[PDB]
Design a protein around this nucleic acid. Structure first.
Ligand SMILES: [Zn+2]
Lengths: 84, 52, 52, 122, 88, 133, 97, 50, 50
RNA sequence: AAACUUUCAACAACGGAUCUCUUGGUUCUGGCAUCGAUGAAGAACGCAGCGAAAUGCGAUAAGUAAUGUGAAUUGCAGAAUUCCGUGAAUCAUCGAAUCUUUGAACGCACAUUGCGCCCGCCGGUAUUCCGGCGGGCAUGCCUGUUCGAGCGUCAU
RNA sequence: GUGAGCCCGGGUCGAACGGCCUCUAGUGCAGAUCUUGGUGGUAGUAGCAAAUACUUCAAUGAGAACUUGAAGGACCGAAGUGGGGAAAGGUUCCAUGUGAACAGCGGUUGGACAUGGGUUAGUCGAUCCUAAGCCAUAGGGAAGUUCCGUUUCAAAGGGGCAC
RNA sequence: GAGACCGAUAGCGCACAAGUAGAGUGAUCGAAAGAUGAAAAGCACUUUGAAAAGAGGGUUAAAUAGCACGUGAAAUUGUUG
RNA sequence: GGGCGAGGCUCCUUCUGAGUUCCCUGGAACGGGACGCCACAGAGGGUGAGAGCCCCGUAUAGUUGGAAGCCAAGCCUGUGU
């Protein structure tokens, strides 16, 4: 039917960078790294990183979108905000 | 079409290769479902549907 | 009822050559259109000196 | 067959009620094709299964709502469907305690000078 | 030629069906219903046409919720189940 | 003469209620008197008629006929009695509708609800007689 | 003298409900008496003299007793309305009679 | 036209289903007053007003 | 019963057959006294018909 | 003389007056206070074994539950009702529910059954693809929470 | 009985009605180019005369100028009486059957009546874009229903990096 | 709940599937239309007709009540004298 | 200051008197004649024609069962920070 657009599906939806992850979770970088270590969120590698992000380099860290969405429901985020 | 093929599969174990749908002048939807060549539509109509 | 015979829109066709100058119900497509109204001598009209 | 009494349904719990609902829906789906293929006494049966499906759904919904009311028995906020309906004006009306609150000066005056019970001799 | 021949050129539509009142009164260029006044919030009514008011007044339709209110008032808006009744 | 303000002596309202009464009201309206033996047995003057009762016709052109009530047709306010029929032109039989006030019940179709009705009517009658006596 | 140059027919008030309103008032009085029993249904009113030179020959019932009257009769002004005595704080006593 | 919307086609479908005579068992009912379909429509006679 | 039902259906059409309606759908009411033919006066200027 | 025209009478037509009827109006009197974002009034589309309307209802669709009554419904067809009963009915009452698309109508729209976004669940070989289901996303305003901006006023 | 009228007989008919004295009124018709409805003479009359035109056999049927098949004769003459669409209509399309009504003559025929059937898309359209234009938001008028305003006197948001 | 009201051209526009059918682009305008019989017992069967129907023969207390249906006026028409 | 509270009121629910006696007309008595009965019920309606006694109801005191409020004669108590 309607024509799909480029970059709206595939690895672009499968992965996100660390910047997009911290902006999605609205966390500081130490809290994000701490929560990733505690919950077992591991860095990933796409086959083509340019399909995920055009500004990605060899040092860019990637995570799974479903992993970040699973982190989005962690009760420790409320604890972080309460402590702040 | 996806809902029709899913309902056919989970009702009568029917595998369809394609489905064409129209809406009749009386307001109901009519669906033509073409089956896989391995299964026989005449056998399905005789046994599962009872259309003889 | 104080509205009896006055729940119509009717106007006299004027002095002419054919019909009397009673007010006649406007419109079309029904028997009521063109018929007289508001008179005590008219069918379905207000009577003379309605009772209070 | 196919006319399930409500007295039988009021003793079952959730899973076998869903099983009965499924088998009634399956037999209804079969007997609609039987209706369009031939004419017989099966029309009474499809009417019976339609009413049986209605009864099973009613029983399941009633038990679900009773369990939810028991869960929300002692909580401050209830779901809007479980809250009492009344009317909109009745819901926005002041509560009986807020309507019966009086000032402390009024409380003192009503405490020490209430309406007395009296009679006048003739 | 203002009559019969000019009536042949009538093949457009000034009004379409209104989503709120169902009449063919929704002006296709102004997007305003001539009967109920959609898309204004209030339904259009005037006091110079009691007939027009009575054609759409409450009770001329279905009374789908409002017809059950007097019975609930008569019973006092009670809530619950009759004592000893079968159920959950 | 009626005294209570909830009672209406309007003929129009009475006829509207009678001809638009629902089925449960028409059951009460279609009552029949009991026979002398049943009256002295149960201390009950009247009871609603139902299918399976045994009646005797006391009015109309079918007087003194006796039979079982085969149908209570509440829509036209009539009852059907066995063998109280007429012949159509074709030769088939067709039942003749009788009003229940034109019959008298000679044998009651008895079940526990009917016994409950008769017992409570008899109890109310004897209570009323004892109170007014 | 009498003229009808306005639309007088919109505001003609007939009184066919006069006996019904009398019945309603009597029922309300019986209900009030039953609620207030054994107290009287009305309050004690003072005797006052009508104003102007036309009506000063006659006395009638007033609104309520003055504070000076209550103090001279020995009834406190808070107890007085609770035993069926009407109290009026606007009226003054200009003479001893 | 052949080009039509779903709403218009739905209204035409309802009109097509309503365009029928009354069943013959209606006239044999007790106290029946209906003798014909007094709201019957024809394509040439009167318009749907859509 | 089918014969009686068909007879009732055919006897229901007698008034519309005397009115010469083309079916039960023909319910159109014709203007028997039109205003343009039964009102106004013909002056020396422009006329409403030729 | 017949025909024709006219008059009188009888019967038969045409038509629907008159009389009698009235589940209807009209007027008066008495009582009562009860609509809606917990989604109203109104609109559309559907639902019966056999219905187009009226009536009733909403995919639980001429209806479900509950209470009461106690043997029907009926135009046909087909089944009843263990009749000494968790029980007929187009029954009544009615406190539990269901309540399609809309509409103040609320994701953006709507002359589109158009286009989105967020979070879960399920199925198809599937970390990416495809589909289905569920719960949400209007505006103004009030109270509170939390994150903030400003050399606006200061303390340090 | 002067009279308006009253009473009786004969026929028709099927559920109510009358005399007298008071009370009450929406109370007495030939007209109003009166209102509604119904019906006459005209009158079996005017008329059914544009678009060149029909004929033979057989079948169907109670009944055939206007149904069908064949046989002939003609017409539209490619700016058509052809083949397809847009608006508008909504089932008029197709099969089977048909009493009445309608097809200003007939009718077995029919766009009529009755019962059924029929419209299948990743590729054709809509859906997307903007045109002329219209409607929100900010804000300002207006007693108000609402009007102006569509880039503004708006804190109107995107991306990246980080031991 | 009632009436010194109206009794289907009246009374509300509507006693009936009436704010319906129908008309109008639209705002809006807006009807006509009740009564077989106690009970369908709504004419079996024969006969003439292509059928509608007719004639016998029936039902009914009555068809001089035949789903054109209580009563059945006048205008107007047919036949007979 | 608290807490009981007899009892009463308001609302739905079960139940209530007496001829289908005889004769005539009639298709059918609900009509006419005779003999009765009930009535704090002879209002109204239905039933094959004008029915107090055929049926529903109607009149009056009550009498079963249930829910929720209100009024209330009296009775237990703490006493003054
Ligand atoms: Zn509208």
């Amino acid at each position: 039917g309607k024509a799909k657009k480029k970059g709206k599906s595939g690895a672009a939806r499968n992965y996100m960078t660390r910047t997009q992850a911290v902006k999605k979770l609205q966390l500081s970088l130490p809290d994000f790294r701490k929560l990733c270590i505690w919950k077992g969120i591991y860095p990933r590698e796409p086959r083509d990183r340019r399909k995920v992000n055009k500004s990605a380099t060899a040092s860019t860290t990637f995570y799974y979108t479903k992993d970040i969405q699973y982190l989005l429901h962690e009760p420790l985020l409320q604890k972080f905000r309460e402590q702040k | 079409k996806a809902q029709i093929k899913q309902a056919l599969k989970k009702l009568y174990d029917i595998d369809t290769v394609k489905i064409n749908t129209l809406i009749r002048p009386d307001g109901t939807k009519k669906a033509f479902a073409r089956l896989t060549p391995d299964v026989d539509a005449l056998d399905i109509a005789a046994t599962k549907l009872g259309l003889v | 009822s104080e509205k009896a015979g006055h729940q119509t829109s009717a106007e006299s066709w004027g002095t002419g050559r054919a019909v009397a100058r009673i007010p006649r119900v406007s419109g079309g497509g029904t028997h009521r259109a063109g018929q007289g109204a508001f008179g005590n001598m008219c069918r379905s009209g207000r009577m003379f000196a309605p009772t209070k | 067959n196919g006319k399930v009494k409500a007295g039988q349904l009021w003793s079952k719990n959730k899973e076998e009620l869903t099983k009965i609902l499924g088998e009634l829906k399956t037999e209804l789906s079969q007997l609609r094709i039987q209706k369009i293929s031939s004419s017989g006494a099966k029309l009474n049966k499809i009417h019976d299964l339609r009413k049986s499906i209605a009864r099973v759904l009613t029983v399941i919904n009633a038990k679900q709502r009773a369990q939810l009311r028991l869960f929300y028995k002692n909580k401050k906020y209830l779901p809007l469907d479980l809250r009492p309906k009344l009317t909109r004006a009745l819901r926005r009306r002041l509560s009986k305690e807020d309507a019966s609150r009086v000032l402390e000066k009024t409380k003192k005056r009503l405490t020490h000078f209430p309406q007395r019970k009296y009679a006048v001799k003739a | 030629t203002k009559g019969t021949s000019s009536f042949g050129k009538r093949h457009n539509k000034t009004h379409g069906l209104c989503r709120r009142c169902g009449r063919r009164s929704l002006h296709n260029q102004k997007k305003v219903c001539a009967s109920c006044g959609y898309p204004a919030a209030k339904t259009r009514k005037y006091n110079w046409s009691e007939k027009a008011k009575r054609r759409k007044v409450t009770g001329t339709g279905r009374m789908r919720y409002l017809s059950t209110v007097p019975r609930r008032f008569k019973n006092g808006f009670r809530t619950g189940v009759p004592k000893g009744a079968r159920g959950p | 003469m009626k005294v209570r303000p909830t009672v209406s002596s309007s003929r129009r309202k009475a006829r509207k209620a009678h001809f638009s009464a629902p089925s449960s009201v028409r059951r009460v309206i279609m009552s029949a008197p009991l026979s002398k033996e049943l009256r002295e047995k149960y201390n009950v003057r009247s009871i609603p008629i139902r299918k399976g009762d045994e009646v005797q016709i006391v009015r109309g052109a079918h007087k003194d006929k006796e039979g079982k009530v085969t149908s209570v047709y509440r829509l036209k306010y009539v009852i059907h009695v066995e063998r109280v029929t007429r012949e159509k032109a074709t030769g088939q039989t067709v039942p003749i509708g009788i009003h229940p006030s034109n019959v008298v019940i000679t044998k009651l179709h008895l079940d526990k609800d009917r016994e409950n009705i008769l017992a409570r009517i008899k109890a109310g009658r004897e209570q009323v007689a004892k109170a007014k006596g | 003298n009498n003229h009808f140059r306005k639309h007088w027919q919109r505001r003609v008030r007939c009184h066919f409900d006069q006996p019904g309103k009398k019945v309603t008032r009597r029922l309300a009085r019986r209900a009030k008496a039953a609620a207030l029993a054994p107290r009287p249904v009305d309050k004690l009113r003072p005797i006052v003299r009508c104003p102007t030179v036309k009506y000063n020959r006659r006395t009638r019932l007033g609104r309520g007793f003055t504070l000076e009257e209550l103090k001279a009769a020995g009834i406190p002004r808070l107890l007085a309305p609770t035993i069926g005595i009407a109290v009026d704080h606007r009226r003054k006593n200009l003479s001893e009679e | 036209p052949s080009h039509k919307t779903f709403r218009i086609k739905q209204k035409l479908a309802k009109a097509q289903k309503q365009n029928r005579p009354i069943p013959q068992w209606i006239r044999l009912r007790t106290g029946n007053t209906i003798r014909y379909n007094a709201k019957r429509r024809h394509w040439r006679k009167t318009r749907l007003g859509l | 019963l089918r014969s009686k039902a068909e007879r009732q259906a055919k006897l229901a059409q007698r008034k519309m057959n005397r009115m010469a309606r083309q079916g039960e759908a023909d319910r159109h009411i014709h203007a028997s006294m039109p205003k343009h033919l039964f009102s106004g006066k013909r002056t020396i200027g422009k006329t409403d018909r030729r």
